[PDB]
Design a protein around this ligand. Structure first.
Ligand SMILES: Nc1nc2c(ncn2[C@@H]2O[C@H](COP(=O)(O)OP(=O)(O)NP(=O)(O)O)[C@@H](O)[C@H]2O)c(=O)[nH]1
Ligand SMILES: [Mg+2]
Length: 184
């Protein structure tokens, strides 16, 4: 069982840092723009079951985005990341959510698993309030929200445990749908 997870969000919010903290327990203050989309794989235990997570890191800069997007299809979970110190990055979440739905075209979009990460909470200059972020998540059919720090490894393991569990649930349903579709 391979679980495909896609991480989306504006340039600089910490997508690559979150993935590298989780997969490699390493963090760099140095910024290196992500070009295109590619993945790291990690074997993880999901509620006592072994699965391989294919975690796709993507370019936040539009000029660096891959032209091809076939990889979104079949995705099991989409991670939306914003920077709590940068309100513009929280305001683009609907566009990211919509781009994911359009490229992945999942059946039953309202129940597709999304997980939102408000990153860089270690910084002193926060501008996006937890209540405002939670209100948005609730309005998107109650998606899970975690405040993280990739720099200080705060809530990273916890967020990815829910990402893995929800992605497994989704993979499980798609497989069931293919073999036993429910009637109309
Ligand atoms: N203080 C702090 N800095 C962070 C955190 N996560 C990432 N950064 C810093 O923020 C900058 C951008 O991080 P990066 O992971 O490259 O962001 P990204 O979303 O992958 N950008 P892109 O879409 O362009 O590839 C880096 O200098 C990194 O060190 C965090 O939790 N706290
Ligand atoms: Mg990156």
């Amino acid at each position: 069982v391979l679980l495909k997870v896609i991480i989306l969000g504006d340039s600089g919010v910490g997508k690559t840092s979150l993935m590298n903290q989780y997969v490699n327990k390493k963090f760099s203050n140095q910024y290196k723009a992500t070009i295109g989309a590619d993945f790291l794989t990690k074997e993880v235990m999901v509620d006592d079951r072994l699965v391989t997570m294919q975690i796709w890191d993507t370019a936040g800069q539009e000029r660096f985005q891959s032209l091809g997007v076939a990889f979104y299809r079949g995705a099991d979970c989409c991670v939306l990341v914003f920077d709590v110190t940068a309100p513009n990055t929280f305001k683009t979440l609907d566009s990211w959510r919509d781009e994911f739905l359009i490229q992945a075209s999942p059946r039953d979009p309202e129940n597709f698993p999304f997980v939102v990460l408000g990153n860089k909470i270690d910084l002193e200059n926060r501008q996006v309030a937890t209540k405002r972020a939670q209100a948005w998540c609730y309005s998107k059919n109650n998606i899970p929200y975690f405040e993280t720090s990739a720099k200080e490894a705060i809530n990273v393991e916890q967020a990815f445990q829910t990402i893995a569990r929800n992605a497994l649930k989704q993979e499980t349903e798609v497989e069931l749908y293919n073999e036993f579709p429910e009637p109309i």
